[PDB]
A paper describes a structure:
[name] [name] is a surface-exposed lipoprotein with multiple roles in vertebrate host interactions. While the interaction of [name] with fibronectin and glycosaminoglycans is formed by non-overlapping binding sites in the intrinsically disordered N-terminal region of [name] ([name]-N), the globular C-terminal region of [name] ([name]-C) is now known to bind specifically to the initiating protease of the classical complement pathway, C1r. Previously we have shown that the C-terminal globular domain of [name] [name] (termed [name]-C) blocks classical pathway activation by binding with high-affinity to the initiating serine protease C1r, and preventing both its autocatalytic and C1s cleavage activities within the C1 complex. In fact, there are relatively few examples of pathogenic strategies which specifically target the classical pathway and [name] is the only known inhibitor which directly blocks the initiator protease C1r.
Numbering used by the authors: 208 to 348
Amino acid sequence: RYQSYLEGVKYNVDSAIQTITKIYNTYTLFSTKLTQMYSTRLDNFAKAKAKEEAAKFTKEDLEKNFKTLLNYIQVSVKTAANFVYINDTHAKRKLENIEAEIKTLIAKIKEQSNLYEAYKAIVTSILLMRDSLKEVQGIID
């Protein structure tokens, strides 16, 4: 009963952590394509392929990943609202703080026309958020 709440929060927090890693790995890959397409060491064929690849990253994909992240945390918060003990109510409080931050990041992404700039606006925040979510996992398990 109460165990299924703890299990549900653990699953959704783990999925949120994975989603952040997916977003950060996308940023890393995007960055390398932008570097490659202006590189002086690469030939024209290779730079052209890198320019094509840099153009295939979408704001839609970033926004989808952020909606996936928000949804995992929102389920975590709804489930954690059933927590009653001193340590797991603290986990619930951290998750609500993280939910609010995710909404702020989704708003920041909207106000950036340039996709790389949108990633740059959120990378520090999501890296810190992943660490905070790792703390949450320890607080309850």
